[PDB]
């Protein structure tokens, strides 16, 4: 700050510290999981 050098980025608390771990990153696309499971299973038999 004042007539002194800025702290390195790692010297501040985490920027996203208040966002829950399930949000970073979002795991979306759950709808498809089951689909591909069946698919792969099917392919194995092929």
């Amino acid at each position: 700050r004042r007539g002194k050098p800025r702290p390195r980025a790692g010297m501040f608390p985490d920027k996203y510290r208040r966002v829950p771990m399930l949000l970073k990153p979002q795991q979306g696309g759950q709808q498809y999981f089951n689909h591909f499971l069946i698919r792969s299973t099917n392919d194995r038999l092929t």
Partner: protein
Amino acid sequence: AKRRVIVPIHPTPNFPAHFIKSAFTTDPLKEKQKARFSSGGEAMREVQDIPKNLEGERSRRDLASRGDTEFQALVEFIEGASYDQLISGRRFKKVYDVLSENDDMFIWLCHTAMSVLNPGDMRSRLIYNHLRILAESVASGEMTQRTAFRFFESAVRSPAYREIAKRQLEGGAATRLAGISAAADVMRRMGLTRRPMSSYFELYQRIVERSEAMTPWGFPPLFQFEERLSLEPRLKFFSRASGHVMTPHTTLHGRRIFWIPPTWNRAGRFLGPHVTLYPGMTP
């Protein structure tokens, strides 16, 4: 120099003598130093470690009505999971101390078992009695550990000892089973522990851990026992113990157990430990 002057406060109906000498000083180079601590009835008994000397009917009433303190401690620590208490590190510390209380004697016995080449046949009632007596004298503080050890190794065994030792041993190292069986036996027959097994377990365990150490059964003579200068409790031998730019200024701000809670004279902006500034929505 314009030297500041302070006029003495005399004892007052609300301001007794000790309050005055402890909270007030007439010499103003000693102002703004720091906080002093003192102890009262129980915290004094903890810090001063006054061993109770035995006494009349009340003291034996309370030797017979005592029960298991090994257990009572455990219970009281557990009890912190009750709805109306927290779990304390102090309560835990008390449990720990009572469990690990057996290093002064168990440690000694470990030395007599593993630290001595050829301590005769340890099943024989003679050497056995030597060991028994010395043990009961390490407990109850009648002897130094060092003194009792040097007593043990210098104790009278049998005439022409070495030359009978040439008829059994090559390099003078006997087998260690008799030693451990005797050393457990003594702690059992003496009343050393409230629960019988603990003796044997600890004496065994402490040996097993040391088995992995470099030059395990030798010891430097100065650090081996009580002496002026000691090792730190981690390195003792058979011992049981073997943002970021502002958090100078955030030093109060987590969830903090306090001792003395801060007060508005001493803390300008702090709100208290229970406070949540950024609350999430919970059902």
